[PDB]
Design a protein around this ligand. Structure first.
Ligand SMILES: [Cl-]
Ligand SMILES: [Cl-]
Ligand SMILES: [Mg+2]
Ligand SMILES: [Mg+2]
Ligand SMILES: [Mg+2]
Ligand SMILES: [Mg+2]
Lengths: 366, 367
């Protein structure tokens, strides 16, 4: 229908969005995490003005108008902001139809296999394998991702030999009955990445993520065509034209869009379409317990070319202190290695009234 | 001293200035890109200052790369708009430390730069547009003029039926045969429609066709460039260096037009200038208002080896840019027979208005 108001409730780490249509119906979404306060300022300054009082039936076209009206601001922030209104609108639709978003998207509620994703690089290989082994046995995870090199470390490792050690260590401690994934986070050059690539293949890994600087498509494509193991990437890509370019030249084997970094469900679905047309699987990026993971769970239960599993961060409050207490009831309980999309209308989650009380509020209305 | 001790911003919603201070106490003034400058300044302190404070600014290029790598999850305009403010303040500091205008620090010399009168309006009839530009031709001495075609990112639609068809011959008729005529479509057309418009431009001697197609569709722009004889230009919204490399490598345009502040500063703009230089392409930067962006461009144009034909010079008044009034103690934009001037004053050679600063929103970061 038509939007009458857009409100944001945020702190520096995460911000939630509530949209209200003319008839009074409301929906809840979330902008991308990290510097969420800046993102919400951008939302009211450059997104709300173009969406308020407009028909949201053709959301794709409306979001395009936003980016065209703000064409002088290509990049992350505008899209992180857009994602908040988009996701709130989908929650609205689900609640209006009495269906979870997965169903509105043409899918069905149910379980989704998840892979335990480690975010740490400072942690020692021994301690990593140890905590992931406990999760394998207590939570039922059958897929695990660890870190390689140093974050955008210009070919330098977290420390001499960490990557060499962590590769075999993980396969040794977790056994041969689990899937192993690794993420270099744009640390290596095509050649250094190829070196590491072989060490990975020798130990059974099946996922080599962001081996080279993500903005250097060519370098990445060199690794992808040089290795047999799957090379993946795309989490930092929020530009659709660049997405099409990446998929046409096939710089990767698996595409990994982040629903919120990309600009919402609608825009992510465009990448999903580009991916299937090229016959590529979609394994989204979602690295924390904000709503980004839940949004991805609904998406994976609806798209025809979904990857093998849902990225599920296994970090605690020491890494993500801000994600504690966000919801009345967490939607992230794991059941034998799987997450669950329930039949609750919309996203099926409630933002903590206490968290909202402490948030910074801002509204845009017509 | 070459180590930053502090970074301060003075801003309002339209424009924000940056002052940097080295450990020895030396200071330089720069500016972040205009428009939602308050947000840009917030981004500057949150995502730029933390990586630059306390560091040696001798190799500013590498330091700026570190900023983009540390903030790799934030590709896009805002981070670069913020970085541009620290970068330009550092160049002012260097010029002042050396007693030289930035143009000289960059390897160039002070002097005149030919400017082209740039109209920003589409909601102005071809008749009134020609009239005001003709008067500027006679009173200011401009010999180059740029007007607008189509509707801004108008999806092939014109501001109104037939406006572009009328404005082309009107400018040539009214301004005469002895002036250069440029036009900017601001991403309005599809390649086919742009080519039709291109033919009209060529039929009336225009020499510059800017941003004919959506700027993010390099292949579309290239099709136009390849089909038309008239120079096709673009690049003002491009802040990504690898995209710049792709655009130049594929020869999508005939003239590159980086905006010093949208691109992230002088250092980063110089990287694009070099890409263009090696490829044999000229550089005609974008600078659309009387904030410091135009002055920064003036200094750059007095130094690069592959400069284009002229400096973009906005001729809009306070009805269009109310916020650019009273920014400086003395305007650096007085025109002399169609030319702007870079003086030998150290640094940028300008002083921010104390009154404007008094009314600004202040924020500082220091170590
Ligand atoms: Cl941005
Ligand atoms: Cl860049
Ligand atoms: Mg990753
Ligand atoms: Mg391969
Ligand atoms: Mg232009
Ligand atoms: Mg040509």
């Amino acid at each position: 229908m038509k939007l009458k108001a857009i409100e944001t409730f945020t702190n520096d780490a995460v911000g939630f969005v509530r949209v209200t249509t003319q008839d009074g119906a409301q929906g809840w979404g979330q902008v991308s995490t990290y510097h969420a306060d800046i993102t919400c300022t951008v939302l009211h300054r450059q997104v709300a003005p173009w969406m308020l009082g407009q028909d949201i039936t053709d959301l794709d076209d409306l979001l395009d108008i936003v980016t065209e009206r703000e064409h002088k601001f290509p990049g992350s922030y505008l899209r992180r902001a857009m994602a908040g209104v988009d996701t709130a609108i989908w929650d609205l639709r689900g609640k209006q139809q009495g269906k979870p978003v997965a169903e509105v998207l043409g899918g069905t509620p149910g379980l989704i296999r998840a892979y335990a994703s480690s975010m740490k690089r400072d942690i020692t290989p021994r301690d990593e394998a140890e905590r992931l082994k406990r999760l394998r046995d207590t939570q039922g995870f059958t897929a695990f991702k660890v870190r390689a090199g140093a974050e955008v470390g210009r070919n330098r490792d977290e420390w001499p030999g960490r990557t060499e050690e962590i590769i075999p260590t993980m396969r040794r401690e977790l056994g041969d009955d689990v899937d192993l994934l690794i993420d270099a986070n744009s640390c290596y050059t095509p050649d250094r990445a190829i070196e590491v690539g072989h060490m990975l293949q020798d130990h059974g890994f099946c996922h080599f993520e962001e081996p080279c600087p993500y903005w250097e498509l060519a370098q990445t494509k060199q690794v992808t065509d040089a290795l047999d193991i799957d090379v993946t990437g795309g989490e930092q890509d929020c530009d659709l034209p660049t997405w099409q370019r990446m998929i046409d030249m096939r710089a990767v084997d698996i595409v990994q869009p982040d629903i919120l970094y990309l600009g919402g469900i609608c825009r992510t679905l465009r990448v999903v379409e580009m991916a299937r047309a090229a016959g590529l699987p979609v394994t989204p990026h979602c690295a924390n317990w904000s709503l980004v993971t839940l949004f991805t769970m609904h998406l994976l239960r609806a798209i025809p070319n979904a990857g093998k599993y849902l990225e599920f961060s296994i970090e605690g409050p020491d890494y993500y202190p801000w994600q504690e207490g966000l919801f009345v009831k967490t939607p992230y309980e794991i059941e034998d290695g799987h997450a669950r999309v329930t039949d609750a209308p919309g996203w099926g989650v409630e933002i903590s009234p206490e968290w909202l009380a402490r948030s910074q509020y801002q509204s845009s209305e017509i």
